[PDB]
Chains A and B, each alone.
Chain A
Amino acid sequence: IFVYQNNITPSAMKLVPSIPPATIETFNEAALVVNITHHELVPKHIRLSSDEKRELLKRYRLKESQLPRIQRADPVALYLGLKRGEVVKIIRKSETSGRYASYRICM
């Protein structure tokens, strides 16, 4: 994680995929003043290992691209550090039912 202050050079933005095993995740420290997962409108995102991604897709009989999608540059997908093809689990409080578990894949 490379926390910076004003900017990283566009010449230096090419060094992010420069390591194919290892990732570099850059955050501007003005965007880190408030942890956005503590906000009332943001539910509990939990990321699923493939031992239960696969058991999710076996219950509902889903291809991976038929799930609801979360973006690669979402403020909570960048928080958890989601690679593409990783299902995150959302437990949100419905007005009707209370705690309601929903799922969403990163593509």
Chain B
Amino acid sequence: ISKPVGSEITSVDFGILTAKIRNLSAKQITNPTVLDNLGHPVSGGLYDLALGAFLRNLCSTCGLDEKFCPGHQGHIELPVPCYNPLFFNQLYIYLRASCLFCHHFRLKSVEVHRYACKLRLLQYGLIDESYKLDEITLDISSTLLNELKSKRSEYVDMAIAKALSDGRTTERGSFTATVNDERKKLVHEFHKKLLSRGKCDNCGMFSPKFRKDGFTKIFETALNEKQITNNRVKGFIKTGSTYILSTEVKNILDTVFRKEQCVLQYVFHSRPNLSRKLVKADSFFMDVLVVPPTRFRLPSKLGEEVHENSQNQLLSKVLTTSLLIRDLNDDLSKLRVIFSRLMNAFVTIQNDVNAFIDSTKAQSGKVPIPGVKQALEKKEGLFRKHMMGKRVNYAARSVISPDPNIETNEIGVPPVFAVKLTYPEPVTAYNIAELRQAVINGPDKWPGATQIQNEDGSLVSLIGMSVEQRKALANQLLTPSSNVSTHTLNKKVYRHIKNRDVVLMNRQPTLHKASMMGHKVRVLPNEKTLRLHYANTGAYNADFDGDEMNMHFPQNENARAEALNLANTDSQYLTPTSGSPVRGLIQDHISAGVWLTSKDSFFTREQYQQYIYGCIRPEDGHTTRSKIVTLPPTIFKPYPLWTGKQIITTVLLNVTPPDMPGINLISKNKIKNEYWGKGSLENEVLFKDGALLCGILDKSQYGASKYGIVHSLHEVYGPEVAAKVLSVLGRLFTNYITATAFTCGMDDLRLTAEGNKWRTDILKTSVDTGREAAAEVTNLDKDTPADDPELLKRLQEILRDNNKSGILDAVTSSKVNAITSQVVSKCVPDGTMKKFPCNSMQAMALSGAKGSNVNVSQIMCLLGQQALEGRRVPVMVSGKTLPSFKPYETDAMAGGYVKGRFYSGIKPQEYYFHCMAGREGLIDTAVKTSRSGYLQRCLTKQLEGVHVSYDNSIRDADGTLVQFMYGGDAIDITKESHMTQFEFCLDNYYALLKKYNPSALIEHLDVESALKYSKKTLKYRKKHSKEPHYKQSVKYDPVLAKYNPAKYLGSVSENFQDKLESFLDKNSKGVNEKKFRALMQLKYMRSLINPGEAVGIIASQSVGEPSTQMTLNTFNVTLGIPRLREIVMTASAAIKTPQMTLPIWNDVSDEQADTFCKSISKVLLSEVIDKVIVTETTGARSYVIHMRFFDNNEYSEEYDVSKEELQNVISNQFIHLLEAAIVKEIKKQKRTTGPDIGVAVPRLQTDVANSSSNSKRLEEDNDEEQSHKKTKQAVSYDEPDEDEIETMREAEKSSDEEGIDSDKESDSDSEVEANNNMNKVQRDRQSAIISHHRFITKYNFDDESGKWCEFKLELAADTEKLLMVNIVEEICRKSIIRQIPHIDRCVHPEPENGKRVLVTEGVNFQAMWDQEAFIDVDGITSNDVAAVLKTYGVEAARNTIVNEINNVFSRYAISVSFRHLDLIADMMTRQGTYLAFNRQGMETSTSSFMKMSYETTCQFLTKAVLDNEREQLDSPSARIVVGKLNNVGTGSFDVLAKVPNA
């Protein structure tokens, strides 16, 4: 740190190396020899000694040696200009669009002038002026088009000079995302009009259209026979695709680019050009290569075997070919075959520089040589492996181990780690006493040192020395060296890691920021592992069975201060997802407080003094009073004794500060009052002035639980007091456990003889349950016996269906789950042998120590119904669920109901079914892994510079504003925990008043102002309380929108304001109400989000981390992460299951609503047909189709379909489909009837790639596959295996000029009863039905009953046998009777909270507007966000995003905050469209190093060079690349030192 840097990199320009590389490096390379015999670097070869020092030779350029030389570049003189494969796709546009005769483009010179003059407007901060250029429009002569150009350029010269007169732009221009959105929309359009034209508009003589191949050859076609007639009526006033040489194309595109310099000056620039350098054509062509320095091209090595480099292997092949095409040019210089090898040498000198840059865009054995482009694009490569993911010094990793004898904010460092990791401590006047002792001890004895740094920069290692030299060198530390260059610097002793340093500590999948916290160091002897407290196991999510954690040891005081104040564990008490506490005692401290704070717990005096000093030690600094204070006992006369609740009072009396009064808390336990006995009150926890007066303490109080005692001390006394209480209670219930143990035995599991009599009799009533359910489902009655043969017919019918037999598996499952909960409800509190305190089995479930009441019931009572895939046990084909059971056995036990228990044993049949249910969870073990890995990375690249500003707005790193306040009210989630808990704050008023101390605070912030404006807006809102939101008069915008919350007292969100009023009005309780507002409006002000806070990352982590918790299956609607992949990623215009919630009115009734669902739901004609009886006869093939509908009283109830509509679909849609299928099938009959026997068809069952997942790694068990994912950072997946990723891999087609322009095909070469006695009507309906179809010839319809239909297709006599019934069954399943479009089925579900709604399988907003007599059309709700965007605008599309992300999390009972969901939905709709997080959404962005580092690196790289972009270096992914300090947090401001003298 003693070598400061002055100048530093502020912005990065992209650009192209001109062929004046000959200035910087004329050390050119002509010999393709790398080394000679006897190992020397040959002169003019690829390892020349002017390219840097190599093999212990000096550099011919530096004069410096093997190490100190920086390396130097060298060029390879190509004799011919072969083009560049990066910029080739973007000159092939410019070659196809130019007229070779006129040397212009194909377009009009004024249509080109329009786009050239709008792009001049876009490079300044003005866009509406670039749409007002199209409003200048007034068989056109030449004097009109040169004046039209004069007035368009007249407007722009005033449009820029107007804006630059203001501050709306600068001379260097302006550039934003929405400015870059419009520029991409013109240039992509300008590169689409030019690509398709017929003739030049400035001449007539038009060029023949080119066609290319794999990036190496340019071919020009011969202009066909029709078009030369144009060339000779206008111009006068060899074979297909001849070759075009590489020097011709430069000569073409030089006079094209010289002529239209005006348009190309604004295509290749997005900011104004300030050097006014010319866009030239030799930017596209490579006259020379450059060669990287020798240090970057060192030989590869494996063992002793030192191979040759990849880069030299490709670069020699170019240099042999360059000498050839030079040597053969001498051969042709003396005048056939020599012209055919020169032209073939141009193919391969281009092909070997195409090989030098790309690998796939060259030809390759199996896997060819990597080019410089393909060294960059994956998880591996360069841009993510070595720029976002560097490896670090001063770090260590080890297995972690449990420890209750360290502090909760600490790590126990082994002495193996401790004598290696060193910290440079500059020796000064205040630390020479402790740094002399460090040099004396040396690098063996622990509080010592390893090396000292002199003032000149050199180090001196202390390893080999003895105590003579080390004591004689510790005494020289404050000695000044005689130099004057270094008279400022002092020495730096690299002391070992002491007990006062800190450490970043890192569980390896870092899914959120509390997985990387900052611990203090405590060096423990005699250990070989890192050693961690139990309070930290929930934060890192660690299980102490072989987890490795990285120990990062930072190296300067700007990092020690930030691991002690920002990333320490004490500030990470509440998680940012919901504000819940994540730190607390876990298993056996929970089950000791239930004994210590119990009412039997009496301690004598010598025992009382021991437990206090066992946990609290004043030497370590745990007391605040420097002397342990105690309490009088609760029993005086027979013997002095202390109660166990009085120890908890004492340890709170010592760790809390003496000035603030005690904690006042009313809460609950997890343990019910009746477990203690009659009239016990040990469920209500009561603290009164810091004294536990009532109730035991559990997981609910000092666990990771909200509004407990430890969560209350965090609010009243702050994070360091609550840190000490978990440390003190961690040692109190460890020394109490040692003196008074805890065990779980066999008597804890046994029921008493009365209670064991109950469960035999209650389970005796379940022997007759599997048949009562089996007779209910089959709709039999009167208790038919089990072996009744009509029942056995019926049970076989429900064995063959899957939509049945889950009916039987839901009736019988519920009918035996009642007997399950009757045994539990009578036995486990009351039929046990050991009651609650002594039964440690129940006391570990009721405490929340470990387990539940479900685990206790399967031990003591019964296992119960073992349910598989939601249903029940699977059955064979024979109706048997095992080979031990009768087929169709109506029994609970045969269906998998285990009546056994784990205390007494499960029978061999029911042992087997419990092995089935043990496996169906274990298939959801491997599908958990790579679900949310790619989803969170894709969030955290966009929401990554998003940070709170100092004006409370939420802005991206480039300044493009996302929100105006965080969440609506600028509250940190980790601060609003007791903000509405008004009862807790009134009890603790005097203790919380000197936390939020207003006395030394009021003269810095305005008090009277926002209180006055709030009471305007409060009372005015109370006027218009019943007016709807669209009639709300907007005179008074909210007080946060006018006044800074952190500056004006009282400026408070309108939801906190009303809750504070509704508390002060409904409660009358030496505290006024004026002094409770002025505290709770000060608490609001001291609970605000700080500026610089990385709310983008926190919002993306608070979504991606609990989506590692919703990987599970169905316990309809798209569930969990694949719903979240549609909303957040991929921006689905087509959701797989779209819905629409239709709220029905209040005066509509349920009969009126179910009839309404029938009107909307689609009815296929298949749904009203019972049978179709086709009698086929011959003579002409006379097919007779007789349809049997259901009864008219049935389908008119079930579907609300009149029998006149069946006539109006059969006669007008069905037969049009039926006769279309027939003539299609007779056309198949004549043409295609037989294959070619002997010809192999293609493959059968292989996939598209790799033929398997993995041939060896797919058999790794989860204890062996977690051994391969612990020893390395291997949380990634190469192919994340998604179809949406494949649909992100497959989209965005090539062209409309392709092989198929609109998917064109042939489309050519067509040219019972015995009734009679119709009326005149049905005879005449039939006559026009025959006359309007092709084959009908007879027709009838049952109009009296609506029961049947009938017609007689009489076809040709030539035809053969035809499966007519399979023709009919297809057409009936496709013929729609009544479908409202885009909507399949409506249904009326059970209401949530008084909302009578419908659910519509499909989205059509436009059609539901015409049903307002049943549907409140102002309240309909979809989950298709791209449909709400199209219909209701961008704010209703926004509110649908926050509502549909919340369905994914609230379904799994996961409560993310709305402040995190508002920030994502404001980022997805920042353009007014529905963008996602993907490559297509990321495209409209300012910083290019964010783009290059995400994926498709050289895709964005060529885009950044052809744009000639300046990188402003303000996204954090661009600051890490160039090494600049990030500006989100402590980098978001500058520190300046105040010097006294002038």
**Which of B305-313, B352-360, B746-754, B1430-1438 makes up part of the contact surface?**
B1430-1438
| 25 A–B contacts, CB within 8 A, in A order | A17-B134, A30-B1406, A33-B1410, A41-B1436, A42-B1435, A44-B1029, A44-B1034, A60-B961, A65-B125, A65-B174, A65-B179, A68-B961, A70-B1434, A71-B1473, A74-B1472, A77-B1433, A84-B127, A96-B967, A96-B1053, A96-B1457, A98-B1058, A99-B1054, A100-B965, A104-B1434, A107-B127
Q: Interface digits, A86-107 against B, CB 8 Å rule (1 contact, 0 not)?
A: 0001111111111111111001
Assess whether B911 is interfacial by the CB under 8 Å rule: no
Residues of chain A contacted by B1432 (CB below 8 angstroms) = 36, 39, 41-42, 75-76
Interface assignment of B168: CB less than 8 Å from any CB of chain A: yes
Does A101 contact B125, Cβ atoms closer than 8 Å?
Answer: no
A107 in contact with B960 (CB, 8 Å) = no
| A68 CA to B1470 CA, complexed, in Å | 5
**What 7 A-B pairs have minimum CB-CB distances, sorted nearest first?**
A97-B968, A94-B968, A97-B1053, A97-B969, A98-B1054, A41-B1436, A71-B1472
Cβ of B127 and Cβ of A94 under 8 Å apart? no
What is the CA–CA distance of A90 and B1437 in the complex, to the nearest angstrom?
A: 14
Is A40 within 8 A of B968, CB to CB?
no
Q: Does B959 contact A (CB under 8 A)?
A: yes
Verify if B847 is at the interface (C-beta below 8 Å from A): no
Measured CB to CB, the nearest residue on chain A to B949 is: A60
Residues of B within 8 A of A38 (CB): 1028, 1030, 1418
Q: A65-B179, A94-B1462 are in contact. Are A101 and B168 (CB under 8 A)?
A: no
B1434 pairs with A74, CB closer than 8 A: yes
List residues of chain A with CB within 8 A of the CB of B1029. 40, 43-44, 93
Q: Mark B1054-1079, 1 if CB is under 8 A from A, else 0.
A: 11101000000000000000000000
B1439 contacts the other chain (Cβ, under 8 Å)? yes
Is there contact, CB below 8 Å, between B967 and A65? no
- In the complex, the chain B residue whose C-beta lies closest to that of A76 is B1433
Give Cα distance in the complex from A69 to B131, angstroms: 17
User: Does B819 sit within 8 A of A, measured CB to CB?
Assistant: no
- Knowing A43-B1029, A84-B127, A107-B127, say if A67 contacts B969 (CB, 8 Å): no
B633 CB to nearest A CB, Å: 50
Minimal beta-carbon separation of A5 from chain B (angstroms): 15
**Chain B contacts for A31, CB-based, 8 A:** 1406
Distance from A7 Cβ to chain B, minimum over Cβ atoms (Å): 16
Q: A66-B960, A66-B961, A94-B968 are in contact. Are A75 and B1418 (CB under 8 A)?
A: no
- Checking A83, A94, A99 against B1458 with a beta-carbon cut-off of 8 angstroms, the contacting residue is A94
Q: Known contacts A43-B1435, A65-B127, A94-B968: does B1030 contact A60 (CB below 8 Å)?
A: no
State the Cβ distance, B722 to closest chain A Cβ, in Å.
26
Complex formed: what's the CA distance from A40 to B1418 in Å?
A: 6
Q: How far is the CA of A94 from the CA of B1463 in the complex (A)?
A: 12
Q: How far is the CA of A92 from the CA of B1457 in the complex (A)?
A: 18
Task: Indicate with 1 or 0, residue by residue over B935-964, a CB within 8 angstroms of chain A CB atoms.
Answer: 000000000000000010100000111111
Q: Which of B176, B963, B1041, B1457 contacts A63 (CB 8 A)?
A: B176
User: Which residues from A are CB-within-8-Å of B1435?
Assistant: 41-43, 45, 76, 90, 92, 104
In the bound assembly, the distance between CA atoms of A67 and B962 in angstroms comes to 8
Q: Which residues on A sit within 8 Å (CB–CB) of B1409? A: 33-34
Inter-chain contact B1038/A101, CB cutoff 8 Å: yes
> In angstroms, how far is the closest chain A Cβ from the Cβ of B177?
8
Report if B64 contacts A (CB, 8 A). Answer: no
The one of B1038, B1417, B1469, B1470 that contacts A100, using a Cβ cutoff of 8 Å: B1038
Q: Could you tell me which residues of chain B, from 120 to 140, have a CB within 8 Å of some CB in chain A?
A: 125, 127-128, 131, 134-135
Q: How many residues of B contact A (CB 8 A)?
A: 70
Bits for B558-574, please: 1 = Cβ < 8 Å to A, else 0: 00000000000000000
Name the interface residues of B166-186: CB closer than 8 Å to any CB of A: 168, 174, 176-179, 182
- CA of A40 to CA of B1412 in the docked complex: distance in angstroms? 16
Chain A hits for B960, CB < 8 A: 66
Mark contacts of A41-66 with chain B using CB atoms, 8 A cut-off: 1 yes-contact digit, 0 otherwise.
11111100000000000011111111
Cross-interface CB contact of B1054 among A46, A68, A97, cutoff 8 Å: A97
- Report if A97-B1055 is in contact (Cβ < 8 Å); known contacts: A34-B1417, A38-B1028, A38-B1418: yes
Closest to B137 in A: A17
Against A, the Cβ 8 Å flags (1 = close, 0 = not) of B1033-1044 are 010011011000
Taking CB atoms, residues of chain A closer than 8 Å to B1034 are: 44, 46, 89, 91
Minimum Cβ distance to chain A for residue B1139 (Å): 15
Alpha-carbon distance between A68 and B1058 when the two chains are bound, in angstroms: 30
Question: Chain B's nearest CB lies how many Å from the CB of A54?
Answer: 11
User: Counting CB contacts under 8 A, is B1491 at the interface?
Assistant: no
**Residue positions of A touching B, CB distance < 8 A:** 17, 20, 30-31, 33-34, 36-46, 59-71, 74-77, 83-85, 89-104, 107
B residues near A107, Cβ cutoff 8 Å: 127-128, 178, 182
* Contact present for B1439 and A65 (CB under 8 Å): no
Assess whether A69 is in contact with B178, with CB atoms less than 8 Å apart. yes
CB distance from A32 to the nearest CB of B (A): 10
Give A63 to B953 CA distance when docked, in angstroms: 15
Return chain A residues, CB-CB under 8 Å to B1469.
Answer: 68
Q: Is the CB of A98 within 8 A of B1055?
A: yes
A75-B1431 contact in complex given A38-B1030, A42-B1436, A65-B174, C-beta closer than 8 Å: yes
- The B1384-1432 residues at the A interface (CB cut-off 8 A) are 1406, 1409-1410, 1412, 1417-1421, 1428, 1430-1432
A92 and B1432 CA atoms in complex are apart in Å by: 15
Give Cα distance in the complex from A107 to B178, angstroms: 8
Contact A66 B176 (CB under 8 A): yes
The interface residues of chain B lying within 8 Å CB-to-CB of A94 are 967-969, 1055, 1458, 1462
Roughly how many angstroms separate A97 CA and B1053 CA in the complex, as a whole number? 5
Quick check: A69 and B1471 within 8 Å, CB to CB?
yes
A98 in contact with B1053 given A40-B1419, A65-B179 (CB within 8 Å): yes
Q: Is the CB of B1458 within 8 A of A95?
A: yes
> What is the CB-to-nearest-CB distance from A53 to chain B, in angstroms, rounded to a whole number?
13
Q: Does B1083 contact A (CB under 8 A)?
A: no
Closest residue of chain A to B1057 (Cβ to Cβ) is A98
CB distance from B1457 to the nearest CB of A (A): 8
A90 to B1458: give the CA distance in the assembly, Å: 19
> A60 to B951, Cβ gap below 8 A?
yes
A62 contacts B1410, C-beta separation under 8 Å: no
Task: Kindly list 16 other residue pairs between chains A and B, CB separation below 8 angstroms, not including A33-B1410, A70-B1434, A100-B969.
Answer: A17-B134, A37-B1030, A40-B1418, A40-B1419, A42-B1433, A59-B951, A69-B1470, A75-B1432, A84-B131, A94-B968, A97-B968, A97-B1056, A99-B1054, A100-B965, A102-B964, A107-B127
Please indicate the chain A residues that have their CB under 8 angstroms from the CB of B128 in the complex. 83-85, 107
Q: What residues of B have a CB within 8 angstroms of the CB of A69 in the complex?
A: 178, 1470-1472
Which of chain B's residues have a CB closer than 8 A to the CB of A37? 1030
Residues of A contacting B1440 with CB < 8 Å? 41
**Chain A contacts of B1058 at CB under 8 A?**
98
How close is B405's CB to chain A, nearest CB, in angstroms? Answer: 43
Residue of B nearest to A94 (CB): B968
**Nearest chain B CB to A46's CB is how many angstroms away?**
6
**Nearest residue, chain B, Cβ from A77:** B1433
Which of these, B959, B1028, B1472, contacts A70 with CB under 8 Å? B1472
Measured in the bound complex, the distance between the Cα atoms of B729 and A29 in whole Å is 72
A99 x B1038 contact (CB < 8 A): yes
B1459 at the interface (CB under 8 A from A): yes
Expressed in whole angstroms, the Cα–Cα distance for A76 and B1030 within the complex equals 13
Are B964 and A101 neighbours in the complex by a CB distance under 8 Å? yes
Cα–Cα, bound, A38→B1439 (Å):
15
Query: Contact check: which of B135, B971, B1037, B1417 meets A20 at CB < 8 Å?
Result: B135
Query: Nearest chain A CB to B1026's CB is how many angstroms away?
Result: 15
Given known contacts A63-B174, A64-B168, A100-B1038, A44 and B961 CB-to-CB distance under 8 angstroms: no
B1032 on interface, CB distance cutoff 8 Å: yes
List residues 1443-1501 of chain B with CB under 8 A from any CB of chain A.
Answer: 1457-1459, 1462, 1466, 1469-1473
Q: CA separation between A102 and B1034, bound complex, in Å?
A: 13
